[PDB]
Each structure stands twice: as C-alpha cells, then as structure tokens.
Amino acid sequence: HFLCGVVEGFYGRPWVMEQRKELFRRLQKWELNTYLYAPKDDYKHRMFWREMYSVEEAEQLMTLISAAREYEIEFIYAISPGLDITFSNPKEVSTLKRKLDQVSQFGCRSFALLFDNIDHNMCAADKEVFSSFAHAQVSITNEIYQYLGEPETFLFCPTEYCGTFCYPNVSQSPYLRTVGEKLLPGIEVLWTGPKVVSKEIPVESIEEVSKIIKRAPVIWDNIHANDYDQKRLFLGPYKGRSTELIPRLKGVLTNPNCEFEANYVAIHTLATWYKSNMLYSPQMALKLALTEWLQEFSVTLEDLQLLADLFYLPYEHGPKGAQMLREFQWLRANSSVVIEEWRSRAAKFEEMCGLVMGMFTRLSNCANRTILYDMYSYVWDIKSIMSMVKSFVQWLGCRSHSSAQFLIGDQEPWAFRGGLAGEFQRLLP
Amino acid sequence: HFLCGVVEGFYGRPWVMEQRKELFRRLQKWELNTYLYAPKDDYKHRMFWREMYSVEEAEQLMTLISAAREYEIEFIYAISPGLDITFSNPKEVSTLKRKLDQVSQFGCRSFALLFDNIDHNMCAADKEVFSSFAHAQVSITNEIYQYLGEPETFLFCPTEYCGTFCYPNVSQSPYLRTVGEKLLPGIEVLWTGPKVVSKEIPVESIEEVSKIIKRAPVIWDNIHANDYDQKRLFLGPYKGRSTELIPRLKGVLTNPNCEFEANYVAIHTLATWYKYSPQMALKLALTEWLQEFGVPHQYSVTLEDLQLLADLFYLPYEHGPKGAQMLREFQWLRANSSVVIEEWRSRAAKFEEMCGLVMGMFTRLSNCANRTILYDMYSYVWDIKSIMSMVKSFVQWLGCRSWAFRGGLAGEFQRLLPIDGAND
C-alpha cells in the first residue's frame, strides 16, 4: 500500500483540531490516504515527549483520530525522543512504551519514531551499551515496533535523513549502513532526498539510498515547507519529482506551509501527481489547483496566478514573477538613457505593479476571511515592496527633470525595512 | 476622564475573543482603563461596515462587551465608513445608525467614527450638499453623536490625523479648522503625533494641534505597531512621550504589535508611564514578564534571555544596547578580517559566544509552558536565531586557515533598491 498525503512536521505554531479535520476532508476528496502527525513544537510530541496527554488533550486526540478514520485517512502518530532520551536506561524505554500505549488507546494503529535534527553524540551510559548512535536508535525502534504487535505502518526518520546530513556521504555512511542491516524489514524509513529542501529528487539518488537502507523509502517532502524563512510562502505546483519514482517509493508525505489555507495548491498538485501514476505536467497541475481553489474565495483567477507566481517554489519564481524581476533589472541597468524603449517599458512595469496592488485589495475584500488571514502578511509584504519598486521606477523616469534624492527628508519606519535582523543580513555577502 | 489603554487598530488578522478577554485582565491588573475596538481587517468594522452582525456574531460581541464591564475596562466600538460612504444619502446615515444601534443593544455605550486613510475627494452628490470634506464628516459625526444620546465617550478620527498629513501644515489646515469649529464639544479627536509612527510627540506640537481643533486630543499611539513590516517586532519601553503631556491630552491609546503576547512590555510600560525612566520601566516590565515563562509541570528562560530578546526587537527608531553592540562587533570583525592580531581572534571568540546566547534564548523559549507566548513570537525568534547562526559561521569562515533566495521574490526586489540599507 503506497502512503500518500501530508506530514504536519514543521517548526512553529501547529495546526489546530478543526484545521486538521478539514485537512482530512481535503485529503479524502483528492484521493490521498495518509496523515503523519509530527509538529516539532507540539510540546508532547518532542520537547516533553515523556509526558502523557492530559484528560482534555486525550479527548481532543481521540476525536481527531476518529475523524481520520471517518474520512478514510490513515493516522500515523509520531514521537521525537532524541533530544534527551538515554537509550539504554530501563525507565526511558518504558516511558516511551507507556506514551505510545496511551495513544494506541485513543484508536491509533500506526506510529513513527523520528530522530531527525538532534546532536549526533551519546551520553556516557549509552556509550557503554551501544557501539554507535545508529545501534542505540535501531535497538529502541525494533523493540518498540515489536512491543506494539508489529503494526502494519511503522516509520523511522533517521538522523541522516537527506544527502547533506549523511556522514561522510550517502553510500559509505556507517550510520545508514547500520540502519539498513539492523532495522526490521517491516519498518519504513523516511527520506527528504538529496537536501533538506530538495529542488529535485532524481531516481538515481533514490536507487542509491535504497541499496544502503535495503528498502524503498517514504519521502518526507520539504518542497512547500516555509518554516525556515519568515518572508517565504510556496504556492507553486509539486515539481522536480518524476512520476517514475512512484514504483520506487513506499510513499510521499508532503510537509507543507505553516499557514494552513496556503496549502491548497501544495496538496492538490501532489494528489494530481500521485493519481497520474498510482505523464504529469507541473503547469497543468497548477492550472487545475488554482481553478478549483478560486471557488473557496472580487478575486479573479488571474489574481491567483500572479499570487502563485510571486510565492512559487523554493528555487524558482513563477512566470509573472520572473518577468517583473527581469524588467526591473533591465529598467535599472538602462536608466542612464533618461529612450522611447525605456519610457514604454517603464509604463508597462508600472502597470504590472498595479496588478499586484489590485490583487492585494481584492483579496483584502474577499469573503473567505480565513484564507485572507493566513496569507495576509505575505500579500501585504509583496504589495508594499512592489509599491516601493514602482515609485522607484517613477523616480528614475523623473531624473530628466529632477535632481532630488529618492527619499526626501524624514521617513516613516517602513521606508527602511527589516529592523536589526535585516541589518545583520545585509552585512552577509 | 483620561482614557489610557489599547486600540486594537492594526491591519491583519485581528485578535480573537480569548485574546481580548486576557487583554482586559492585563489592562485592569495594570490600572489602565480603555479598549478601543478598531481592527482594520475585521470585516464588519470597515470593508463591510454596512452589514449587521449575525446571531452568532452578536452573541460573541455581547459576551466580549460583558467581559470588558466585568474587568472595568471601558469598551469603545469604532467603525470606519469613510471608504465608500455617500455622506448626503439619508439611507447611508440610517445604515450607520442601525449598525451602531445594534452594537448599543449588545451593551456598548461608547463609540468612535474613524476617517483615517481615505481620499480627500468627495463624490458629485456630496459636493452638492457639503462645502468641504470636513463639513461632510463633521455633520455625519455630530448627527450620529446626537442620535445616540450624546454618549459620554464618542471619538472621531480625522483624515488629517498627524502633523505630516495636515494640509498645508497643522496650524493652518482648513480641514482641521472646520473640525475644530463644527465638531460638537463633547466629541474627542484622535491624533498620532507629528507622524504616523511618532519618534517623539513634543509638548509644543500638542499645544499646536490643540489650538486648531479647540480641544486636547486623545493620542492614537503607533510606537509599538508592527503591521507595516513583516520582519519587525517592538518589545522595548514606551518612550519619547513626556509625562508632561498628560495634563495636555484627553488620553493615550496604544496600537501595539499584531502578535498579542508580544505586547506585555508595550502595555506594562505605558501603564508605568501613566502611573518616568524608559530603562527603569523596561526593567520592571521584563522582571514581571519573566514570571510568564516557566517550563511545564512534568509527571515523568532567564531575565538575561529577555533583555537580549528585547534589545534585538526594540523600538521603531532605536535598537536596544546589546543589539547595537553585536552589530558594531560584527561590523568591526568584518572590516578587520584581512588581518587573518590576538585582538581579532579574541573579539571573534567573544562575538561567537554572543551569537550562542541568541541560539540559547531560542532553545529555552521553546521549553516554555505558555505555548501561545512561544507561538506569537516564534517567527521573529526563529529568524534572529537563523541569522545569528549564519553570522557566527561567517565569522568562523573569516578565521579558517582553509540562502540565495533568502526572503523570496520580495527579498530580491528589495536588494535591487540601490537605497537598501540607507538607514543601517
């Protein structure tokens, strides 16, 4: 059975229960089948993983697990104990068994142990007992897997979870070698591809990792994740993953934007890609997503296309975005001519900027307040900056009659963006 | 009675019921007394000001207003009809009356009409009936105020609401002359100072504006507002407003950070100011703020962390001492790197330890039991910890013998403005 769906696996504010229920509804409707529960900052998932859910938390989770079963989504419950567990201590192993049994009593039948993003060293006690980190991790994981009656779905996220985190590299790492040899065959392995955020996940990268882990991985895809950069948001199509990976993978679970409503395109296009090969065009999958998303929102299709192009993919701007940048780069490189070419290219660029502003004001006025609030700060930010760029292009055109500086005298604080953070950033090459 | 408290007055996601009731507790605890409801993107406040509350919304607003009374906070309900109102259409007037009457029935007794951030140009039909934009605003505001029974608190926000918006200047504004002359004496005028986000609000500028509006204004203070720049947050102390303003003002309502829990300092130091040294009030606010940060109770964050966090996200026109120190240290290390004395190595090591305190603050805040406090600040703290981590690596690199898309499209355009970093 191929696992396809969403992992809530990002850093920051987790989704709340009704967002999660809505997500299941979306996953079902688009024929996805899986939800992995792993929010880095839900405190009982990681920071205080020893802690039992309270009576009130237990009711909420039981309700959530019932909703998943009601929408035919498999609910995988993850836990992340690696920051401070003593792998050899008797009391630790049973605290973990006790935590997982509680969740099993809520109705959960599928589980995961995640060991990503922790210090690669062991305390003195585990060093007496295990020959390496990998041995400590695989031993606790096999024992938990057995303890729970070998559940049909059990996931392991390695500490070396992408190319970049392999020491010294993927094909020769002693950590992954130990994982491949000793991790029980019914346990799946999570993998994010060559990098944490993979621009592409080439078939030969996956063959290569497959031979060392001794199984087809489940992809934890960070393509649409946006927790690592405050200003960024990803509304472009699922892309850079050939449909030929499907036969070579146990699943793909997408870790998408923090802002719940921003993930319409991320999940809908993943569903299109999946259903295409249970080939795939990213631009046509994007067209279908935006068309259908439009019905949730006055806001036009063309508003949504420009919004997606402005907030597209981690390594790529969309068409309307890449085009505005090119023009601005041109206008700015040729501004000394201030000739009919520059003036008419300027007036077009200013009109393009006007479409950003119109997209902002129509969104601001739409009826779906929930979608507006999740997007608000991205849309405000792009409208403010495009309004400054537009007024800069005007100022360059005005240089034939004015020697005044771009900013005249005392400014409001938003004329200089980024605060102390932005000052450190500007001192980096 | 002097109004001192908070306007929920910013753009973006508004606060929800639970955040607002918590606000009213803090205001009462610190002896503030006023809340002005005015969130720019709460639908029926502005974009859809004509539309009446549904049964479910009425229930919520009523519960909110009862909570204010229960905590002894005066609730002022604002509405912002200026975008598309035809002032001479009696149906527009009646719609405004009926919307306010509906809120009266929820228990509300104080009100505001806001005309900020709108065009000076009236429609043809209004130009018939009124001699100026200010006559149009003043006669609807006077009519509403009399219609509601001359409520003891009624506020008016002018279109010319700070010094730099006043045409041709403050002392000679025809708009403000008419406001000063026609607006009934029981109606208060809102004012943000010399600018939208005022660095200082000098006594003389208040004497100036008061003469033309013929009354002491209520300050709408944007010193801690952060809706205008995604990357900014303000945890430094209320500052730049002399306590000698108090006998010259009818109140101060602070429009603070969009992230509710980030506003502990902004509101605690306003209370201190109201009841003055900014560094002393900062120290009192952070000392009391610390008590909100404990780890959760288990069955199986320091004052110096908070001082550093406030200094990294201080005030719109100044960084806190530790933030300015780190930035000067980094500048120097960078300017003197071609050298690699024992001096640069000594100072690079001390700087790396400073970067480490940033990363430690993030780690300990992530252990906090009040999860709403961590979530409200999360994206600012993650951002400064990521940058510092990169900066510490760069300082290591400059000493070793041996992100291209950061900020996305917006970041790219911004770096192309040849003016970028002009104020650094």
């Binding site: 403010s384 409001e412 938003w414 | 753009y11 951030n117 939208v196 944007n222």
Partner: peptide, 7 residues
C-alpha cells in the same frame, strides 16, 4: 489607501 501612506 492600502496602509497609512497617501497614495
């Protein structure tokens, strides 16, 4: 007006 700045 989209913010507190005259268009």
């Amino acid at each position: 007006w989209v913010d507190s700045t005259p268009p």
